[PDB]
């Protein structure tokens, strides 16, 4: 199919659950007709060839055009082999620098993916029906229960579990033991000040 690409995947720890990290070099090629239409719409180009040359030269304004046109437009991420329907999910793109796709850690279990050489493919919906199906059916935030058994699929693992386990533990004789606090904010203020363990 057309309007498709693929590349290696990295981890984005700052992303939200409904967001993905897309290289802008890929996005410039994927959304080219949309960029042509938007350039013609606001008078920057008067002919189709003018917009074609502007995109070929990669002028400064075409990046603003791309950022405007990728504002609310889901893209489909798929990893082979697609063993179940959770192998294809919809995400909102965020333009990034580089050549790797950033993936939310919490969705790595549904894809059965790890960051040691895995590659993913990206597809662009075209029509309004396709975009609304991506937003309302294939969005990641809609897929939180497993259709096979009903169990959750957003189970935290590894680093998050280790950190939460470490912070929610008690020691017999730690610094700051035996005092009374007005609330959680005072506890955080004491911890950040080095006055309590």
């Amino acid at each position: 199919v057309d309007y498709s690409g693929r590349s290696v995947i990295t981890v984005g720890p700052y992303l939200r659950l409904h967001q993905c990290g897309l290289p802008k070099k890929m996005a410039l090629e994927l959304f080219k007709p949309f960029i042509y239409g938007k350039l013609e719409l606001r008078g920057l180009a008067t002919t189709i060839k003018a917009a074609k040359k502007m995109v070929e030269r990669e002028e400064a304004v075409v990046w603003d055009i791309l950022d405007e046109v990728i504002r609310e437009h889901p893209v489909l991420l798929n990893r082979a082999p697609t063993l179940h329907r959770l192998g294809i999910q919809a995400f909102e793109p965020v333009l990034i620098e580089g050549k790797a796709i950033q993936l939310h850690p919490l969705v790595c279990a549904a894809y059965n993916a790890d960051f040691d050489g895995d590659q993913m493919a990206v597809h662009v919906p075209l029509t309004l029906e396709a975009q609304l199906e991506a937003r309302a059916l294939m969005m990641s935030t809609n897929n939180i229960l497993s259709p096979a058994n009903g169990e959750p699929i957003i189970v935290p693992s590894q680093d998050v579990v280790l950190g939460l386990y470490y912070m929610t533990r008690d020691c017999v004789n730690a610094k700051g033991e035996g005092m009374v606090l007005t609330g959680p904010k005072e506890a955080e203020r004491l911890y950040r000040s080095g006055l309590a363990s």
Binding site: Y3, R85, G87, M138
Partner: protein, 148 residues
């Protein structure tokens, strides 16, 4: 022997030292194993991996996008991806995958023209590979046809 060699170099025996956060300057709460390891760069470079396509060339027979990065090729949407789309119930996404993106000659042009004009609508049409299949079956002496 490793511990003796560490002692010879005035280094901690356990092999763990104290580190500080570069952004805040505060010490990490536990000793960290710090040392030297031999690292290799493998012949899997992202420069050779990244590829994207909007439109390009097509096969003469099937009228479908070519495969590979040497040509400006597209990604294959196989049977398992079709099953995944069917399990969601996204009929329009599957239909636009099947017709206006791969092998509907008039549909591709109409969709491109509508996208450039800001109208996100499609006319599905008939895939060309089905016509190729019909012709190939007719070449075997079997009368297969569409009716009504």
């Amino acid at each position: 022997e490793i511990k003796e060699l560490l002692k010879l170099g005035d280094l901690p025996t356990s092999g763990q030292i104290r580190l500080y956060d570069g952004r805040t300057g505060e010490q990490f709460e536990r000793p960290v194993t710090v040392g030297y390891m031999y690292m290799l760069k493998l012949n899997h470079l992202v420069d050779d991996k990244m590829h994207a396509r909007s439109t390009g060339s097509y096969s003469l027979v099937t009228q479908q996008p070519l495969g590979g990065k040497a040509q400006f090729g597209g990604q294959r949407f196989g049977e398992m991806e079709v099953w995944a789309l069917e399990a969601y119930g996204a009929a329009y996404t599957l239909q636009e995958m099947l017709t206006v993106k791969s092998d509907d000659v008039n549909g591709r042009t109409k969709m491109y023209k509508n996208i450039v004009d800001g109208n996100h609508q499609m006319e599905p049409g008939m895939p060309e590979s089905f016509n190729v299949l019909l012709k190939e079956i007719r070449s075997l002496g079997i009368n297969i046809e569409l009716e009504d």
